[PDB]
Design a protein around this nucleic acid. Sequence first.
RNA 1: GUGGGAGAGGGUGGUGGAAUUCCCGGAGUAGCGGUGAAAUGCGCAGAUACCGGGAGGAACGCCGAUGGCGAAGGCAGCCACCUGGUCCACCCGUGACGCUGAGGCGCGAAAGCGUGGGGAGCAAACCGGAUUAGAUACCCGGGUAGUCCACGCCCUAAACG
RNA 2: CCGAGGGUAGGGCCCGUGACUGGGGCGAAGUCGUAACAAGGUAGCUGUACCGGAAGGUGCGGCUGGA
RNA 3: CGCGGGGUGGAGCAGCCUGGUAGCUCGUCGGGCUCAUAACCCGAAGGUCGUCGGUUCAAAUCCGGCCCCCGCAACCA
RNA 4: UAAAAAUGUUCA
RNA 5: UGGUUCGUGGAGCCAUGGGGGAAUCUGGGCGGACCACCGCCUAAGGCUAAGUACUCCGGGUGACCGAUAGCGCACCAGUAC
RNA 6: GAGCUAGCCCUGGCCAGGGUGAAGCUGGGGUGAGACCCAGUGGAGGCCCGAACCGGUGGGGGAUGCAAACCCCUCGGAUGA
RNA 7: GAAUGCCGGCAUGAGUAACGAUAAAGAGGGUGAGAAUCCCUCUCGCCGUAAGCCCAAGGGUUCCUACGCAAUGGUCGUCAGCGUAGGGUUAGGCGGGACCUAAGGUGAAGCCGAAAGGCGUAGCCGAAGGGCAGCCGGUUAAUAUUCCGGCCCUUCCCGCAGGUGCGAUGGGGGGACGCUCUAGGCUAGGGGGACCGGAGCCAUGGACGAGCCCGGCCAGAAGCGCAGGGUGGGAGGUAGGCAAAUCCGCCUCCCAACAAGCUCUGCGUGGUGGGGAAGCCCGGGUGACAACCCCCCGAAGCCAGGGAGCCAAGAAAAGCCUCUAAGCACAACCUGCGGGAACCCGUACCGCAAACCGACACAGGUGGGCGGGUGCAAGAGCACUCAGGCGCGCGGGAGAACCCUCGCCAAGGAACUCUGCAAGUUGGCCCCGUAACUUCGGGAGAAGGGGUGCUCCCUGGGGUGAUGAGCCCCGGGGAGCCGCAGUGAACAGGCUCUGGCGACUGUUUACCAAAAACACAGCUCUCUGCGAACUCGUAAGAGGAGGUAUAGGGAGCGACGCUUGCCCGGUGCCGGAAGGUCAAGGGGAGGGGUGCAAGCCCCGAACCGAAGCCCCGGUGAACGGCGGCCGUAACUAUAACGGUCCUAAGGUAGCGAAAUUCCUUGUCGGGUAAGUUCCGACCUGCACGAAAAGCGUAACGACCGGAGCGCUGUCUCGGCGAGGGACCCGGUGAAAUUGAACUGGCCGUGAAGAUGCGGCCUACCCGUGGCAGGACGAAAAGACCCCGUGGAGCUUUACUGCAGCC
RNA 8: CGAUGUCGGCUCGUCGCAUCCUGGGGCUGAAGAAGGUCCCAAGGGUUGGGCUGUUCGCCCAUUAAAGCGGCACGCGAGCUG
Lengths: 48, 271
Amino acid sequence: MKRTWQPNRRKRAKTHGFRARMRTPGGRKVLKRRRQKGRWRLTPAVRK
Amino acid sequence: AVKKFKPYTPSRRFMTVADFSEITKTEPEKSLVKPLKKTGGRNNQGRITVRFRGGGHKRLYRIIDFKRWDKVGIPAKVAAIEYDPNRSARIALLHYVDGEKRYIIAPDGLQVGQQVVAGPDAPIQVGNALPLRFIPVGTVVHAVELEPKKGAKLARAAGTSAQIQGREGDYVILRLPSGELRKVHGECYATVGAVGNADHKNIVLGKAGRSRWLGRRPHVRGAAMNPVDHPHGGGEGRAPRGRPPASPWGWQTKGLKTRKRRKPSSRFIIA
RNA sequence: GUGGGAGAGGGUGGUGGAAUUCCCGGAGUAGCGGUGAAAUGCGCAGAUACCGGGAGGAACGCCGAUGGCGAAGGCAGCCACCUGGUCCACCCGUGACGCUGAGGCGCGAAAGCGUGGGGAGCAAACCGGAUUAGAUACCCGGGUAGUCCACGCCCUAAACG
RNA sequence: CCGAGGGUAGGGCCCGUGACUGGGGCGAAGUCGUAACAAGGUAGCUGUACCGGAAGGUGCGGCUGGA
RNA sequence: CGCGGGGUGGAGCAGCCUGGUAGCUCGUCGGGCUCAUAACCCGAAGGUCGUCGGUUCAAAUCCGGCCCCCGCAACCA
RNA sequence: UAAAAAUGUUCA
RNA sequence: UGGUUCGUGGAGCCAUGGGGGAAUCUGGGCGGACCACCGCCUAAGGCUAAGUACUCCGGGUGACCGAUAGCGCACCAGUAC
RNA sequence: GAGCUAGCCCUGGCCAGGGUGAAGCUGGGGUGAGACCCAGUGGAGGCCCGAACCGGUGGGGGAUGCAAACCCCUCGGAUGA
RNA sequence: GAAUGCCGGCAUGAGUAACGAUAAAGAGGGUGAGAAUCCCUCUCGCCGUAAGCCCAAGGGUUCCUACGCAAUGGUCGUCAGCGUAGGGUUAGGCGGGACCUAAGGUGAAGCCGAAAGGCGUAGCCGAAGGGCAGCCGGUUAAUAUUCCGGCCCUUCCCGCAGGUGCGAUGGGGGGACGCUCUAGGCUAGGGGGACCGGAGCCAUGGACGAGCCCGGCCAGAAGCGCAGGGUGGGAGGUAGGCAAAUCCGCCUCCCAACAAGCUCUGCGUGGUGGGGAAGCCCGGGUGACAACCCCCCGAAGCCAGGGAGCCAAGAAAAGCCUCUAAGCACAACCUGCGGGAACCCGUACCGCAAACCGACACAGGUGGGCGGGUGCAAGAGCACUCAGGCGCGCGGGAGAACCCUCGCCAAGGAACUCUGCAAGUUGGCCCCGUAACUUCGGGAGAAGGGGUGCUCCCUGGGGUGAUGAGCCCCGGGGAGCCGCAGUGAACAGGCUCUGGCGACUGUUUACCAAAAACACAGCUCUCUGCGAACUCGUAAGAGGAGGUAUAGGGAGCGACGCUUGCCCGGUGCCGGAAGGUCAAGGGGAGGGGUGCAAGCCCCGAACCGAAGCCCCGGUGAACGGCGGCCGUAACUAUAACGGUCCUAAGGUAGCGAAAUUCCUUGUCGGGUAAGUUCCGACCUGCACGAAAAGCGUAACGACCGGAGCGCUGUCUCGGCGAGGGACCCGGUGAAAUUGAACUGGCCGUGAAGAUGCGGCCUACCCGUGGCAGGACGAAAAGACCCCGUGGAGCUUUACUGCAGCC
RNA sequence: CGAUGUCGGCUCGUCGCAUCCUGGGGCUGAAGAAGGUCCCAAGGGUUGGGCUGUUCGCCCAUUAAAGCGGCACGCGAGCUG
Ligand SMILES: NC[C@@H]1O[C@H](O[C@H]2[C@@H](O)[C@H](O[C@@H]3[C@@H](O)[C@H](N)C[C@H](N)[C@H]3O[C@H]3O[C@H](CO)[C@@H](O)[C@H](O)[C@H]3N)O[C@@H]2CO)[C@H](N)[C@@H](O)[C@@H]1O
Ligand SMILES: [Mg+2]
Ligand SMILES: [Mg+2]
Ligand SMILES: [Mg+2]
Ligand SMILES: [Mg+2]
Ligand SMILES: [Mg+2]
Ligand SMILES: [Mg+2]
Ligand SMILES: [Mg+2]
Ligand SMILES: [Mg+2]
Ligand SMILES: [Mg+2]
Ligand SMILES: [Mg+2]
Ligand SMILES: [Mg+2]
Ligand SMILES: [Mg+2]
Ligand SMILES: [Mg+2]
Ligand SMILES: [Mg+2]
Ligand SMILES: [Mg+2]
Ligand SMILES: [Mg+2]
Ligand SMILES: [Mg+2]
Ligand SMILES: [Mg+2]
Ligand SMILES: [Mg+2]
Ligand SMILES: [Mg+2]
Ligand SMILES: [Mg+2]
Ligand SMILES: [Mg+2]
Ligand SMILES: [Mg+2]
Ligand SMILES: [Mg+2]
Ligand SMILES: [Mg+2]
Ligand SMILES: [Mg+2]
Ligand SMILES: [Mg+2]
Ligand SMILES: [Mg+2]
Ligand SMILES: [Mg+2]
Ligand SMILES: [Mg+2]
Ligand SMILES: [Mg+2]
Ligand SMILES: [Mg+2]
Ligand SMILES: [Mg+2]
Ligand SMILES: [Mg+2]
Ligand SMILES: [Mg+2]
Ligand SMILES: [Mg+2]
Ligand SMILES: [Mg+2]
Ligand SMILES: [Mg+2]
Ligand SMILES: [Mg+2]
Ligand SMILES: [Mg+2]
Ligand SMILES: [Mg+2]
Ligand SMILES: [Mg+2]
Ligand SMILES: [Mg+2]
Ligand SMILES: [Mg+2]
Ligand SMILES: [Mg+2]
Ligand SMILES: [Mg+2]
Ligand SMILES: [Mg+2]
Ligand SMILES: [Mg+2]
Ligand SMILES: [Mg+2]
Ligand SMILES: [Mg+2]
Ligand SMILES: [Mg+2]
Ligand SMILES: [Mg+2]
Ligand SMILES: [Mg+2]
Ligand SMILES: [Mg+2]
Ligand SMILES: [Mg+2]
Ligand SMILES: [Mg+2]
Ligand SMILES: [Mg+2]
Ligand SMILES: [Mg+2]
Ligand SMILES: [Mg+2]
Ligand SMILES: [Mg+2]
Ligand SMILES: [Mg+2]
Ligand SMILES: [Mg+2]
Ligand SMILES: [Mg+2]
Ligand SMILES: [Mg+2]
Ligand SMILES: [Mg+2]
Ligand SMILES: [Mg+2]
Ligand SMILES: [Mg+2]
Ligand SMILES: [Mg+2]
Ligand SMILES: [Mg+2]
Ligand SMILES: [Mg+2]
Ligand SMILES: [Mg+2]
Ligand SMILES: [Mg+2]
Ligand SMILES: [Mg+2]
Ligand SMILES: [Mg+2]
Ligand SMILES: [Mg+2]
Ligand SMILES: [Mg+2]
Ligand SMILES: [Mg+2]
Ligand SMILES: [Mg+2]
Ligand SMILES: [Mg+2]
Ligand SMILES: [Mg+2]
Ligand SMILES: [Mg+2]
Ligand SMILES: [Mg+2]
Ligand SMILES: [Mg+2]
Ligand SMILES: [Mg+2]
Ligand SMILES: [Mg+2]
Ligand SMILES: [Mg+2]
Ligand SMILES: [Mg+2]
Ligand SMILES: [Mg+2]
Ligand SMILES: [Mg+2]
Ligand SMILES: [Mg+2]
Ligand SMILES: [Mg+2]
Ligand SMILES: [Mg+2]
Ligand SMILES: [Mg+2]
Ligand SMILES: [Mg+2]
Ligand SMILES: [Mg+2]
Ligand SMILES: [Mg+2]
Ligand SMILES: [Mg+2]
Ligand SMILES: [Mg+2]
Ligand SMILES: [Mg+2]
Ligand SMILES: [Mg+2]
Ligand SMILES: [Mg+2]
Ligand SMILES: [Mg+2]
Ligand SMILES: [Mg+2]
Ligand SMILES: [Mg+2]
Ligand SMILES: [Mg+2]
Ligand SMILES: [Mg+2]
Ligand SMILES: [Mg+2]
Ligand SMILES: [Mg+2]
Ligand SMILES: [Mg+2]
Ligand SMILES: [Mg+2]
Ligand SMILES: [Mg+2]
Ligand SMILES: [Mg+2]
Ligand SMILES: [Mg+2]
Ligand SMILES: [Mg+2]
Ligand SMILES: [Mg+2]
Ligand SMILES: [Mg+2]
Ligand SMILES: [Mg+2]
Ligand SMILES: [Mg+2]
Ligand SMILES: [Mg+2]
Ligand SMILES: [Mg+2]
Ligand SMILES: [Mg+2]
Ligand SMILES: [Mg+2]
Ligand SMILES: [Mg+2]
Ligand SMILES: [Mg+2]
Ligand SMILES: [Mg+2]
Ligand SMILES: [Mg+2]
Ligand SMILES: [Mg+2]
Ligand SMILES: [Mg+2]
Ligand SMILES: [Mg+2]
Ligand SMILES: [Mg+2]
Ligand SMILES: [Mg+2]
Ligand SMILES: [Mg+2]
Ligand SMILES: [Mg+2]
Ligand SMILES: [Mg+2]
Ligand SMILES: [Mg+2]
Ligand SMILES: [Mg+2]
Ligand SMILES: [Mg+2]
Ligand SMILES: [Mg+2]
Ligand SMILES: [Mg+2]
Ligand SMILES: [Mg+2]
Ligand SMILES: [Mg+2]
Ligand SMILES: [Mg+2]
Ligand SMILES: [Mg+2]
Ligand SMILES: [Mg+2]
Ligand SMILES: [Mg+2]
Ligand SMILES: [Mg+2]
Ligand SMILES: [Mg+2]
Ligand SMILES: [Mg+2]
Ligand SMILES: [Mg+2]
Ligand SMILES: [Mg+2]
Ligand SMILES: [Mg+2]
Ligand SMILES: [Mg+2]
Ligand SMILES: [Mg+2]
Ligand SMILES: [Mg+2]
Ligand SMILES: [Mg+2]
Ligand SMILES: [Mg+2]
Ligand SMILES: [Mg+2]
Ligand SMILES: [Mg+2]
Ligand SMILES: [Mg+2]
Ligand SMILES: [Mg+2]
Ligand SMILES: [Mg+2]
Ligand SMILES: [Mg+2]
Ligand SMILES: [Mg+2]
């Protein structure tokens, strides 16, 4: 049956994007933890 | 007249529709800077701020002239009389002699090929629009401005009208279609006569749907809504309000007077 | 046919004043009201009485008559438009073309019903005050339909000469 | 092939009967008021309308079969 | 079983709360008005205050025991 | 436009 | 109203949203209501090292661990998942 | 976090084939004119049967399942809220 | 050693359950160390609005090829969507971008907010929308309207020639648009042919037969036909297009008009290009220089912005025409013809799925397009079947119980049961023929029936043709034949009577409730005059509304019919410029602390002081509420009548043991052999009752109740049979649970239901198939109950605040 | 209470006796036939329906009779619900 994850690449970049984060002051403050933690991906990986 | 329908299906036995004679001859709207895209969703920025709106026929806006005092003394031949889905009332399409054409809310008796005009100069006959101060006391008029130069805002519903009761100072006194009794500036313009299509009040939607067509979503009593949801809500199975009638926000809904006591508008009114 | 006459005959649109009620302004006091007698009620939060100004509804005094018109029901301020019936004279025109009328169709006071409007006065129901052995009556103070208009029904009556 | 009748099914007319229920007629001396006949002590009657233990009361119009 | 209310002339109710005094309406009895009946008028009689004790000098009245009256509650599994 | 006033068993 | 130990308390002092509203040293503020003496200091402009804090980084010690310990990672982990 | 779910906005798409037979017309009849009654034409409908599609009514299976809601039979709607 | 402790390892159950849809397999060859499982061939079965083709999304090399199989493959594997390696995705005309705007996002200005930030004009961003130039074949192991072949277009720049006042982001036109139903021509697609072209075939009795088998196309500019869509031409004036215009819009008038012409598509034709079966011989050849014609059916597509009707009244901007403005007219556009110029991104492969969403090659979920033939009325339905793809990755046997899915059954026939639950009967089309009731539409497909094959003859209409043959499409009438049977297979209701609730279609608890619940048209009350009320927000602002009382919000009631009574004492709301009360504040009589004083400070009485409360009235489709006791009639009974008490008033109409009645299976009546259910009545209605509506109501209902008829394993009562498991063999191989175990019965005893204590009785050791009584059997540190001065959600005339409003 | 799933039905029963029936027996106000009461005796039997969820009852038609109890008001790792 129609499950929770239903991928859409446009929706992924628009939502957890990078330009996407950087807008919100919370979103900038994500990158910070992420980047300070030493993640290899500050953003969900999804290519066009 | 209102058409009725034979009971070959319920919902459509109680149904009635507008008499559509007074219109015809033109049904496609006068494109010429006359329609506009009409933006159309229930709420404001995020949140619904008028419960129970939505759906309902795609609909286009006719921009209508509500302050006739531009083309003053310019006369104008009424081209036809059409349907506007943004009002209870009919609107007529006139062609001025400038060439310039505008929509106007179409009063009872107004018939195609009438000359018609605005200004003080103007003769007291249907569809002509004068400054109240120049209008003969106790005639019926419609689309009255309230503060002068701020446009028409009174009497515009299907078949409504204000009547004059006489002047007193710079203000004339009108009985509004509500019955109230407002001193109004004489400089307010107002087109003469009653708004007609007054068989409107006579129509029966008939079925659940139809309502939807006009984009009026279903509505639910406070009862059948849990207590968290609403005053009247709750109680083990059907129970007499609770005391006393309230909006789902908390305010008495039988009786409780609402307008601003200390408002300036007060002291021009009387009814 | 011609030429004249009288009439609240009917439908429509407009309009005049008197009076009642309410609103406002003024002035002015202690009672007004109502009854067989009272009380209920109203009023010193300033009523009744008087003056001015405004709204609204309904009905139309005098003329009015024991009068007139209409087939009946019925019809009464004034004006105009549309329209029915009727009498008279002239004796001109048609040539018995007539009377009645089972059905059918039409109209039809009041109350009553439906859809809108309107609502001053009155007033079924209803509340109160009395009266009475009891008053669900008669009398009194209130009062909703209704009474009014448009359209659509009902279509009965001591619709009686 | 018709065909008496039998069967199946659904109708219409009529008669009898039925717990219970509506009003009616009639039966010397039961109870409650007294509406009407003399302005029957609110003139009467009437069509309608609502109401009331009951006769009845009131509204609206009508008659005179009263003044 | 529970909690609370009430037994007062013949009928319906007052009187108990801050003990000494039992009142209203109807009825009933005598007497009037009428020719009579009702109505009305004038007069009067009528109560162990459910009961068994005890508090007080005094108890319808304050206190416990029952007899009937009337109401409310009797829930969760 | 008149005050407050109900009633009278059956049969001859 | 906040600050101070001060939670209205005899409650001043320091700030200050609202109202009123001076003077320039015979001018002003304070010394815990308030006056009187006696003293302290000079408001409504501003700058100013040092001693103080922390340690992503480097160095040295460790009656600190010794791979279920020690940082989540002694091992291409903030990965695979 | 509305890439599931609920609502709304903009923009596109989809609904086989059957079966009833509204109004309007057109003709005839009717009347003073009408109301109106007949056939024929006409395709109305939160109309009916029935896929697709949207649901999930009753029963059975399943219950460390094929599946953290599934399968079989049956059933509601299907130009409309 | 104990924390249902933490991590890791390894046991038990177990060689057990299971190996993922009952669409299905068999054999002969090969390859190999070895294969039911890989390759080939011949049979057989399954899908086919498909389990078949083409896209979009998502995935992301899974595509192709050469080597391989350790692990992944629930068995095997010589195979693979697996490991290693190498190849593979070619565009000016396809999709997206150097075009446009939609919701919405952002956002110069401008407004707002302690900060972070929030609104918002123009503008820009934003698309399966508008705009825009490619069709057909051929090649690769794997790519192509992308390479190539043929035919056909698009833009820019430049040059030449010929024409014109050229000229904007500005003006106007246009783009531009709903639903439903249809006209005519075509086209896609398909069915025939005694015609054309073909390898072959007579095979078992017969047929060389207008026999059987197979195929008889596709694209194509100019020009031309055939269907249509769009479209009046004029000349003057002009107070409008925020007039800058000879453009548009308005008027006034010589002509013309169910037209003609101009113009733009569709389709046919077309120089010519390409394709071209079956079969047979090894994907290729041959079948060939293949044939490539006629007729019939025919669209949901094309001409299309065509027409008609209806209302709930149906996007925007650009390209595209046109008009002028600055400016420039050696400019500049416009029309031909030439040369040149034409980028960035995606092109593999899966794609209803073993390559996407579900941890799994998970019987689930997934948008668009094509979807052949025959028959059944039609159809994307059903049965078989083209093309094309499959046999679903564990098998071989045996045939017990038992389980699932399925078929049949004597006599009966709901006797089963909470309930005919389940299953059965019914079941398509055509024609008869159908009741009460009704709002006249319905109820109706009511019921109850008859027909339903094939053969021959006669006969009526239509479409295509030419009125005439064919070819299809609707009929009517006669005779005759065969069976148990003719919608002989498959897909297609059981019917009725009578209550309850809700009017009706609709909606809901995704995962136990689809309903008498919600919604619904309609009814009433109330608020709101418009910078409306109301809602969201600190505000700005926005919704309401680019609306305006025949309008908007709140509340309840719920089609429709007949109706909706009495009490405002109390609570609420509404109305009362008199009063009582009242906070700051005003006011200061009078008092007090200090100083030698001027003074500086404290308290502080009358009085003047708002809303609110009090008080006065009003208001029920505002919250609410609508009694008791005793007596009475010439038989008894009953009580029209009376008395008295209390209330704010004391339940009217209509219903009534009712979804409401406790006593109750109330008491009669009906139905039944028998009925605590049901229907009809009565009515001491423990606790009906009028818009939390009252009483009714045709039609509706996968709603709840009662009764018939029909038919049946539901049952008396069971039996037989089919397949899929269960059992046996081979292969792979789990689970919860588990103090350890050498884990019998009775009578007892024991913390009160002992295998483990006592007495006694039985009892060789070990398994396999079964059954389920016990191990107070497993599972979830009981949901119930209590406890915790534990926690939440909810309410109000609990307390204290706060938003809001006065 | 780190859970012993509750009424009724169905299926399968088993045991007790204070025996409903059948077999013995003593009294009887036992003439006979029927009965009354008490004693011995469960070996085996101890029906089908209507109503209600019902156990229980009350009815219909029978019968030799239509017994009463225990077994966690026997039995849900057997079913129903
Ligand atoms: N038959 C007359 C109609 O019925 C009624 O009449 C009946 C009754 O009303 C009437 O009853 C009367 C009563 O009215 C009057 N006030 C008292 C009288 N004793 C009664 O009498 C009645 O009952 C008694 C027995 O009790 C019988 O003996 C007597 O015959 C009978 N008439 O007697 C009639 C029966 O016979 C209506 N009242 C009358 O108006 C109507 O027109
Ligand atoms: Mg996308
Ligand atoms: Mg936002
Ligand atoms: Mg609602
Ligand atoms: Mg609820
Ligand atoms: Mg409330
Ligand atoms: Mg609340
Ligand atoms: Mg309730
Ligand atoms: Mg409530
Ligand atoms: Mg006055
Ligand atoms: Mg005349
Ligand atoms: Mg009348
Ligand atoms: Mg009435
Ligand atoms: Mg009326
Ligand atoms: Mg009056
Ligand atoms: Mg008297
Ligand atoms: Mg009166
Ligand atoms: Mg009349
Ligand atoms: Mg008369
Ligand atoms: Mg026969
Ligand atoms: Mg007698
Ligand atoms: Mg009288
Ligand atoms: Mg009398
Ligand atoms: Mg009289
Ligand atoms: Mg008289
Ligand atoms: Mg009368
Ligand atoms: Mg009556
Ligand atoms: Mg009366
Ligand atoms: Mg009268
Ligand atoms: Mg008493
Ligand atoms: Mg007494
Ligand atoms: Mg005494
Ligand atoms: Mg006496
Ligand atoms: Mg309970
Ligand atoms: Mg008497
Ligand atoms: Mg007498
Ligand atoms: Mg006698
Ligand atoms: Mg502080
Ligand atoms: Mg300050
Ligand atoms: Mg100091
Ligand atoms: Mg000091
Ligand atoms: Mg100091
Ligand atoms: Mg500093
Ligand atoms: Mg070491
Ligand atoms: Mg570690
Ligand atoms: Mg080690
Ligand atoms: Mg670690
Ligand atoms: Mg969503
Ligand atoms: Mg005609
Ligand atoms: Mg017709
Ligand atoms: Mg439908
Ligand atoms: Mg349907
Ligand atoms: Mg269906
Ligand atoms: Mg189906
Ligand atoms: Mg749903
Ligand atoms: Mg199940
Ligand atoms: Mg099970
Ligand atoms: Mg279905
Ligand atoms: Mg220990
Ligand atoms: Mg465990
Ligand atoms: Mg472990
Ligand atoms: Mg085992
Ligand atoms: Mg086994
Ligand atoms: Mg097995
Ligand atoms: Mg098969
Ligand atoms: Mg093989
Ligand atoms: Mg097949
Ligand atoms: Mg992709
Ligand atoms: Mg491959
Ligand atoms: Mg290989
Ligand atoms: Mg391997
Ligand atoms: Mg393997
Ligand atoms: Mg590979
Ligand atoms: Mg743009
Ligand atoms: Mg923004
Ligand atoms: Mg696009
Ligand atoms: Mg596009
Ligand atoms: Mg390929
Ligand atoms: Mg090419
Ligand atoms: Mg120029
Ligand atoms: Mg030009
Ligand atoms: Mg433009
Ligand atoms: Mg066509
Ligand atoms: Mg073609
Ligand atoms: Mg062919
Ligand atoms: Mg042939
Ligand atoms: Mg040939
Ligand atoms: Mg042969
Ligand atoms: Mg073709
Ligand atoms: Mg043409
Ligand atoms: Mg022209
Ligand atoms: Mg200009
Ligand atoms: Mg061609
Ligand atoms: Mg070939
Ligand atoms: Mg570039
Ligand atoms: Mg490609
Ligand atoms: Mg491809
Ligand atoms: Mg598909
Ligand atoms: Mg598989
Ligand atoms: Mg799958
Ligand atoms: Mg998968
Ligand atoms: Mg789908
Ligand atoms: Mg087919
Ligand atoms: Mg068919
Ligand atoms: Mg199919
Ligand atoms: Mg398999
Ligand atoms: Mg049988
Ligand atoms: Mg048989
Ligand atoms: Mg039974
Ligand atoms: Mg039974
Ligand atoms: Mg019948
Ligand atoms: Mg019926
Ligand atoms: Mg029926
Ligand atoms: Mg319903
Ligand atoms: Mg429906
Ligand atoms: Mg659910
Ligand atoms: Mg369900
Ligand atoms: Mg449902
Ligand atoms: Mg619901
Ligand atoms: Mg209604
Ligand atoms: Mg707006
Ligand atoms: Mg409104
Ligand atoms: Mg409203
Ligand atoms: Mg309701
Ligand atoms: Mg009240
Ligand atoms: Mg009140
Ligand atoms: Mg009051
Ligand atoms: Mg007030
Ligand atoms: Mg003060
Ligand atoms: Mg005040
Ligand atoms: Mg009484
Ligand atoms: Mg009853
Ligand atoms: Mg009963
Ligand atoms: Mg009750
Ligand atoms: Mg009975
Ligand atoms: Mg009953
Ligand atoms: Mg109720
Ligand atoms: Mg009421
Ligand atoms: Mg109510
Ligand atoms: Mg209701
Ligand atoms: Mg009812
Ligand atoms: Mg439904
Ligand atoms: Mg249902
Ligand atoms: Mg078998
Ligand atoms: Mg094995
Ligand atoms: Mg034991
Ligand atoms: Mg031992
Ligand atoms: Mg032992
Ligand atoms: Mg065993
Ligand atoms: Mg066991
Ligand atoms: Mg077992
Ligand atoms: Mg357990
Ligand atoms: Mg526990
Ligand atoms: Mg609890
Ligand atoms: Mg607590
Ligand atoms: Mg327990
Ligand atoms: Mg345990
Ligand atoms: Mg014995
Ligand atoms: Mg039963
Ligand atoms: Mg037993
Ligand atoms: Mg038990
Ligand atoms: Mg169970
Ligand atoms: Mg058990
Ligand atoms: Mg057990």
